[PDB]
Structure formats: structure tokens, C-alpha cells
Write a protein that binds this ligand. Structure first.
Ligand SMILES: C[C@H](O)[C@H]1O[C@H](O[C@@H]2[C@@H](O[C@@H]3[C@@H](O[C@@H]4[C@H](O)[C@@H](O)O[C@H](CO)[C@H]4O)O[C@H](CO)[C@@H](O)[C@@H]3O)O[C@H](CO)[C@@H](O)[C@@H]2O)[C@@H](O)[C@@H](O)[C@@H]1O
Lengths: 219, 212
């Protein structure tokens, strides 16, 4: 009858963070030593964390130590797992369990488990911005650089290595439904100065260490 | 059940001006009101509490007043740094309700945008994606509507827009909306149009292009 339900799983980049919550039914968390265990793709189980009765003692697996945090909410019966500086090896199904028996002792097995939440750590920590031209056509016109499918906050742009500043507009980044960002940078220049003058954007993505330069020409 | 109503939602003012932001409570809240300053991206900064108690470090140009239902934030002599959003807050023991916010910006004259449409680059097209961009250049005020009309069919849930801060010198805004289609979807249609609705426009401006 006793039930446990983990929530909060999903996909995360390497170096990221994700919090898992564990909720229960037909028992109170108060007197139980709450634990987290994961099933690594290899097949086996790795004991993750342990939280003693009323948070007295908190134990962690060597690998997860100093990156993960176990927490308890006795009043609303909740168990939490903070996962930071996340590694690819942290990819597993996460189960929250309890040390229990018919009469609670000083050392009981994990008599109750949750169904499990899937946590997947992606290898790539940073993504490469793809740069595209916004090519032109009353005496004045506009051109720009579309900085796409990239990550993660923040990208800097400058025009003609920093020479062109007047008329420049670099827009706030937009988070796309993919999890990737996209921003545009434009500049208004006179229609006459098109064929003659040369225009290049200077995309600087400090996390990925990316530095891209693209010339914007008509057709 | 306390309802907080700030007024105005947007306050256009010049530097050196003395401006007042009104906050109204649905029922008496005595002096349990707090004013906050919030600049884009940055976290809210507490200015005044207990309706008039100014927090340590907050400039003397800021002023709090009112009780029960009517409250007032006063900025005497506007500094460039003061240009941000202002949130009034009723703070109760274990709850709180905020005002809708007041965006204090630089006043200037109505300026119609310069609209530019950009077809997706052939480079991107080869990669299986099509990003159609619309630009609304140097317009005033901030409130502007953009509609995407592929072969006259209005679009929804494919477009994403972002707006720049008020310009340092000209005091206008810029908006950029990006319509995102698959290469496949893009090649099923001929005419891509961007219809722009703004206060400084007699009628909406439609900037358009055909594939080639
Ligand atoms: C200990 C396992 O993690 C265990 O925890 C849960 O049950 C709790 C547990 O509490 C332990 C107990 O103190 C020991 C012990 O009784 C005895 O040898 O005396 C000492 C103090 O007089 C002490 O070292 O209680 C203390 C504080 O209350 C905790 O430090 C310690 O965690 O054991 C008892 C039953 O023995 C339960 O009433 C507790 O709620 C369950 O998760 C249990 O199943 C686990 O095996």
C-alpha cells in the first residue's frame, strides 16, 4: 500500500543543475531514513544519498559528494535531491527509497521504492552559434547578422571589428523551443554606400570560445 | 483578497523632472507598502518600505507617502539611472501582492518605425531551416504589433520577437520578430509578408517578398 513518487527528471547539459523531489503516500517521512538510488544504463544500482531522521546526518556517494544535496520536509512529507556540476556518468533512473520494517530498527533494508524518474546528462556543455546574413534590398537601408542555434547566454556582437557603432542594434537573445538561443544584430546604412563599403559582424561566444566573422553583401 | 493598482503603467518624462507614481489598495493596508526599483534582467531592489521609510543607500530624490488606500512614489529631479520599472507592494505577514508595474522612460515624440523584411539566407536553407526576419527600426512609443502573413494566411506560434532598450541618444525602440519554418514548409509558399501596426502609422505597413 505504501507509495513513493519521484518528480523532476529530464534532460540537462553537462555542468548543469537539476532538482528532484520525492513525495509519498500512506506513511509519514518523519521517522524514516530517506535515501536516493540510481540505476545506471550498465544495469546496476548506485546508492546516491542518505538523509537521517530529522536531517541529523547526510551521507553521499563519493562521486556525487560536494555536487549533490539531500533535504527533507517532514511537515509536508518531501525529500529533495539537488544535482549540480552534473556529469554524463550521472545519467540514470533515480529512485527514492526508505529504510524500513514492521518495527523500525537501527538498520533496516529499503522496504519501499518510488517508480523512478529519468535523468539524462548530455555530453555537450556548450553549443556552436550558426551565423547567417540578413541581406539588404529610400536612400537608407538595413542589414544584419542572424546568430542562431547556439548557447548559452551570452553572445557579444560588434560591426567592422568595432569601427561601425552608429546605427547598430543588437537585440535580446530569444530562447527557442529547442533549448537553444537566437539573436539578431542589425545596422542602418545609406543605400548609396552599399556596393563600395564592406560590412562584417563580429560574433563573440565566450563559453564555447567561438569567434565568427561574416560579410553581409546583397544577393 | 487585497488588489494593488499602479498608475500610470508607463510614465514618459524628461531628465530633471519631478514625477509621481500612484499606487492604490482595494482595502486599507495601513502603511504596509514597499516600493521597488527593477532594471531589465537585474533583480528588484527595495527603495521604500512602511510607505515612507527609505532604505539605507537609496538617494534623497526618492520619496514615499500615503496611508490606507492611496500611496505615492515621488522622484524629484530625474537621473538617467532612475529610468526603470517601479513595483508597489502590499507586504503582509505571510503573503504579498504587487502592482502591475510602472515603466518610467524618456519622453520624446511619436516616431513611426522603418520596417525591413529579410528572407532566409541560402546557407540556412541548405541546413533544413528557414528564418524570416522582420525589423521595426527606431520607433516611439514601445507599443507595436507585428503579424506574419504567409500567402495572406496569418501565422501564430512560429514567430518570436525581442525589443531593445530605449536608445541612448534618439530615445526610440527597436523590435525584431523571427518567423521560423522548416525548409519543407517554406518551399510550399510564395509570398512572405510582415504587417506592422503602430501609433505613428496612419494604417499598418506591410513589407513583403516572394521566393526569388
Ligand atoms: C538508523 C537507520 O538509519 C534507521 O532510521 C529510522 O528509524 C530511526 C532510528 O533512529 C536512530 C536512533 O538512535 C540510536 C538507537 O536507537 C540506540 O542504539 O540508542 C541511541 C540513542 O539512545 C542511538 O544511537 O534514534 C536517533 C535519534 O532519535 C537517531 O540518531 C538514529 O537515526 O532508529 C529508531 C529505531 O531503532 C527509530 O525510532 C527512528 O525513527 C528508520 O529509517 C529505520 O528503519 C532505519 O534503520
Amino acid at each position: 500500500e505504501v507509495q513513493l513518487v519521484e518528480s523532476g527528471g529530464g534532460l540537462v547539459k553537462a555542468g548543469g543543475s537539476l532538482i528532484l523531489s520525492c513525495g509519498v503516500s500512506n506513511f509519514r517521512i518523519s521517522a524514516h531514513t530517506m535515501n536516493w538510488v540510481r540505476r545506471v544504463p550498465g544495469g546496476g544500482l548506485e546508492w546516491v544519498a542518505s538523509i537521517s531522521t530529522s536531517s541529523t546526518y547526510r551521507d553521499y556517494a563519493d562521486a556525487v559528494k560536494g555536487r549533490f544535496t539531500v533535504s527533507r520536509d517532514d511537515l509536508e512529507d518531501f525529500v529533495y535531491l539537488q544535482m549540480h556540476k552534473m556529469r554524463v556518468e550521472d545519467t540514470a533512473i533515480y529512485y527514492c527509497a526508505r529504510k524500513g520494517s514492521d518495527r523500525l530498527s537501527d538498520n533496516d533494508p529499503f522496504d519501499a521504492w518510488g517508480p523512478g524518474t529519468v535523468v539524462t546528462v548530455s555530453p555537450a556543455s556548450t553549443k556552436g552559434p550558426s551565423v547567417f546574413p540578413l541581406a539588404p534590398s529610400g536612400g537608407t537601408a538595413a542589414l544584419g547578422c542572424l546568430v542562431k542555434d547556439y548557447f548559452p547566454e551570452p553572445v557579444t556582437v560588434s560591426w567592422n571589428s568595432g569601427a561601425l557603432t552608429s546605427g547598430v542594434h543588437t537585440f535580446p537573445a530569444v530562447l527557442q523551443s529547442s533549448g537553444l538561443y537566437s539573436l539578431s544584430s542589425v545596422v542602418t546604412v545609406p543605400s548609396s554606400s552599399l556596393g563600395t563599403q564592406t560590412y562584417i559582424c563580429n560574433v563573440n561566444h565566450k563559453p564555447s570560445n567561438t569567434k565568427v566573422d561574416k560579410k553581409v553583401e546583397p544577393k | 483578497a487585497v488588489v494593488m493598482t499602479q498608475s500610470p503603467s508607463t510614465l514618459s518624462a524628461s531628465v530633471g523632472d519631478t514625477i509621481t507614481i500612484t499606487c492604490r489598495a482595494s482595502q486599507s493596508i495601513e502603511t504596509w507598502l514597499a516600493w521597488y526599483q527593477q532594471k531589465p534582467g537585474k533583480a528588484p531592489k527595495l527603495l521604500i518600505y512602511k510607505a515612507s521609510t527609505l532604505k539605507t543607500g537609496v538617494p534623497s530624490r526618492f520619496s514615499g507617502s500615503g496611508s490606507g488606500t492611496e500611496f505615492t512614489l515621488t522622484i524629484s529631479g530625474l537621473q538617467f539611472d532612475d529610468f526603470a520599472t517601479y513595483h508597489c507592494q502590499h507586504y503582509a505577514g505571510y503573503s504579498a501582492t504587487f502592482g502591475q508595474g510602472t515603466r518610467v522612460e524618456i519622453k520624446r515624440t511619436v516616431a513611426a518605425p522603418s520596417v525591413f523584411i529579410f528572407p532566409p539566407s541560402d546557407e540556412q536553407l541548405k541546413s533544413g531551416t528557414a528564418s524570416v526576419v522582420c525589423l521595426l527600426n527606431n520607433f516611439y512609443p514601445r507599443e507595436a504589433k507585428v503579424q506574419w502573413k504567409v500567402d495572406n494566411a496569418l501565422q501564430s506560434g512560429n514567430s518570436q520577437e525581442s525589443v531593445t532598450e530605449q536608445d541612448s541618444k534618439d530615445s526610440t525602440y527597436s523590435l525584431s520578430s523571427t518567423l521560423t519554418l522548416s525548409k519543407a514548409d517554406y518551399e510550399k509558399h510564395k509570398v512572405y509578408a510582415c504587417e506592422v501596426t503602430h501609433q505613428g502609422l496612419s494604417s499598418p505597413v506591410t513589407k513583403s517578398f516572394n521566393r526569388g
